[PDB]
Design a protein around this ligand. Structure first.
Ligand code: HEM
Ligand code: HEM
Ligand SMILES: C[C@H](O)[C@H](O)[C@H]1CNc2nc(N)[nH]c(=O)c2N1
Ligand SMILES: C[C@H](O)[C@H](O)[C@H]1CNc2nc(N)[nH]c(=O)c2N1
Ligand SMILES: CCCSCC(=N)NCCC[C@H](N)C(=O)O
Ligand SMILES: CCCSCC(=N)NCCC[C@H](N)C(=O)O
Ligand SMILES: [Zn+2]
Lengths: 407, 411
């Protein structure tokens, strides 16, 4: 019931008690681990509300206070009468910060308490949503000195009036299937791009076309908006030693902003809640650039480097991988756009993990996601045992809207 | 039930039914995943079911399930258990069991080779000297002048738990580690404790950076005894780099034969506490872990210094650059000397093929992603993108406590 985690590099042992406050289910059983699987009423709502308000009042050191009992009473009446309830600004801010604190797949959580929360619960239309999003984009980007932020649209009601951002991230590049047979641009975005085209987007059909936003308000049909080009900060990719690198014609955007997830606070569901921080280098240089089903550039780069590509054991892929990642970090730093390398990021996460163990009794962490996709064992998180469990408030996956939405 | 796994690079979806034959537990619950945790005498009563399920599997594999020979074997084992409290495997069952323990080993990326395993039956062994002889023969057979062959040597099973055979070494061949008075370590820091034990037992330590440890061997529950593997049987590879001529002057070498010796083999409820097995290296085990862990030889700094990388900031990726070069050197060196080794691209690609074949013909392939994914360049290997299901099938290889913690010293 009390659990130990060991670091095998340092021999440091930490004791986890926080997992006992765990609510949601993992996908694992006593018989089968699913650790590497990507996706494994009024009566219902009040326990969820109480659970949350209890942790909220405990955090401000007012547990069992009159003001605690009063709010619990208030929320109870509101659920009974209206079948839902509304969070106070304080509770919303606390909830959003804690959903991030609880994000077991996020290596950047040392930052969790420094989060700007934009309350967009007064939004009613897709145009309103677009305005809120541009303001988020501009605030967070901050001329390259990035600041974490989340923008929170109205909560789910009867589930027929959902707010959704149809994009998976606020800023992404289009993907196009070619007559040739190949894919132009980002192969991850082919289906979304087609939906944009079908809804009327005039596609430039280039390699790096910033997708339009497809915004859904109050369960209405989604609408298209183009983010002002001047608000989308992009970085051309060059290498500090290879002058040919720029000739590859590569660039990426500065703002990673996940827009397809669901924020659950006190049993309330925020289906539209785009949030953003800043990139760890490997996200672009390893995953976006080198996944075979993404921009898949390893071969071209290796060729420019004149590596022996005849045999896997020359480690030509590995050599080119390192260089691509050097070029990403270098280009972002030169243009003064916040980026973190995987050594620095994982080192900070270990410090955060120890902070969380001593101050909270644990830190839920998904090792499979936390360990960077290159140089795993030369980062300290590789050697760190982690326990994975689900705490609430949380960010949840949700089905893509085009499968749910009735037009 | 059916469980599906997806490869996110290829969209290939596989269906697992094999997990339904799993009996042992994982450490995980519906409330907590322990998938990154390193380590998460029976009765007649419990023994016969274990024997029976094993012999049912064995007899199905040979297409003789429910045969008279199958039924007679069950009766024979049942009577042996009732009468003696244990039973003896036939040589065929032992070979099958050992092959299956490997097939079922969810942390092993090399399992495409599972059916090609030389099994040495050492169940007639009675003394540490006898053990030493068996182990020398295994080393020589497996090494095969660099053309490595998978092998396992199987010593007598546990009886009352007071007469265990154990190899005290974690691997048959490993380098000594010595803690210095100034707190630095000479040699391999992983083996400091075991090295101290050896010295205490009377080993004369050379006290160098790459001293092959003596074997410490326990037979029949007796105090363990020291033996030096004949040096001529210990194949080693000096490490050099194909383009960097200074790499040789780091003084690095490694041994060719990885032979895990501290695990327990379970077959049909029987426990083989001494069962060293060996295959061949995947390059990263040496060039990433053994050389570049901070708690091991930790050579990253010295290599990057010699390469004149910018070491002032992590974001130059100097550690990553040196890491690749070190790993090129390990593969280059083994290949040049004609010692079997496999790179992490080849190994993982072979594992994916094995895994798909296993799904098709066996209904599953239990796999531990945390262990299967190599410790460098994770996502440019296909396994990173492969969803896996981890569960425990028998026969199996298990961890067991280090024997110096549990041994009752006789004197
Ligand atoms: C401040 C800098 C941040 C860094 C360096 C960072 C780092 C990361 C990384 C590397 C991932 C894995 C992404 C992937 O492989 O696709 C991740 C995932 C995640 N992060 Fe963070 N993050 C940051 C900010 C944030 C913020 C502000 C939030 C919420 C307010 C957040 C919540 C999450 C969640 C829910 C995931 C999992 C997303 C998914 O499952 O696809 N992160 N983070
Ligand atoms: C034939 C070539 C083989 C290759 C390339 C290979 C590859 C590997 C690698 C890279 C590991 C992880 C090692 C570590 O990180 O410490 C491993 C683990 C393992 N292998 Fe294999 N292996 C091979 C043969 C074998 C054989 C012959 C057996 C048994 C008959 C076996 C059983 C196991 C087991 C039980 C583990 C987990 C060990 C542990 O938990 O420490 N392997 N294998
Ligand atoms: C199958 C496996 O779970 C999948 O490839 C995961 C592995 N780890 C990951 N880790 C991060 N951070 N992001 C990812 O997309 C993935 N993909
Ligand atoms: C904490 C973590 O489970 C531990 O470092 C594991 C991770 N994956 C591994 N994978 C392999 N193949 N070998 C190892 O020793 C480890 N160590
Ligand atoms: C967006 C806020 C959540 S964490 C921020 C982040 N650093 N990455 C997020 C996911 C981006 C994706 N991996 C990509 O490489 O585009
Ligand atoms: C021994 C047979 C089981 S798997 C074979 C193997 N390829 N490696 C085994 C473990 C070696 C360790 N990683 C080392 O670097 O010495
Ligand atoms: Zn699990």
């Amino acid at each position: 019931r009390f659990l130990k985690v060991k670091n095998w590099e340092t021999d440091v042992v930490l004791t986890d008690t926080l997992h006992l406050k765990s609510t949601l289910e993992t996908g694992c059983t006593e018989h089968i681990c699913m650790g590497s699987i990507m996706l494994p009423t009024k009566d219902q709502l009040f326990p969820l509300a109480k659970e949350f308000l209890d942790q909220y009042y405990s955090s401000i050191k007012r547990f069992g206070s009159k003001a605690h009992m009063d709010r619990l009473e208030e929320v109870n009446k509101e659920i009974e009468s209206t079948s839902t309830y509304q969070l106070k600004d304080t509770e919303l801010i606390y909830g959003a910060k804690h959903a991030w604190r609880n994000a077991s797949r996020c290596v950047g959580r040392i930052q969790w308490s420094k989060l700007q929360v934009f309350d967009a619960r007064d939004c009613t239309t897709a145009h309103g949503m677009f305005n809120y999003i541009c303001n988020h984009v501009k605030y967070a980007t901050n001329k390259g000195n990035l600041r974490s932020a989340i923008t929170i649209f109205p909560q789910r009601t009867d589930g027929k009036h959902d707010f959704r951002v149809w994009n998976s991230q606020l800023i992404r590049y289009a993907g196009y299937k070619q007559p040739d047979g190949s894919t132009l641009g980002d192969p991850a975005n082919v289906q979304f791009t087609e939906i944009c085209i079908q809804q009327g987007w005039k596609a430039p059909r280039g390699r790096f076309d910033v997708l339009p936003l497809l915004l859904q308000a109050n369960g209405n049909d989604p609408e298209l908006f183009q983010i002002p080009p001047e608000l989308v900060l992009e970085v051309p990719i060059r290498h500090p030693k290879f002058d040919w690198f720029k000739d590859l014609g590569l660039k990426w955007y500065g703002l990673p902003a996940v827009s397809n997830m669901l924020l659950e606070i006190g049993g309330l569901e925020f289906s539209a809640c785009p949030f953003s921080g800043w990139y760890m280098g490997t996200e672009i240089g390893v995953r976006d650039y080198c996944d075979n089903s993404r921009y898949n550039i390893l071969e071209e780069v290796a060729k420019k480097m004149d590596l022996d590509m005849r045999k896997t054991s020359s480690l030509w892929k590995d050599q080119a991988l390192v260089e691509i990642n050097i070029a990403v970090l270098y280009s972002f730093q030169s243009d003064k756009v916040t980026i973190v390398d995987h050594h620095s990021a994982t080192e900070s996460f270990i410090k955060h993990m120890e902070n969380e163990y001593r101050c909270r009794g644990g830190c839920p962490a998904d090792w499979v996601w936390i360990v960077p996709p290159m140089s795993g064992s030369i980062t300290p998180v590789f050697h760190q045992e982690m326990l994975n469990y689900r705490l609430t408030p949380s960010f949840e996956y949700q089905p893509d809207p085009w499968n749910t939405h009735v037009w």
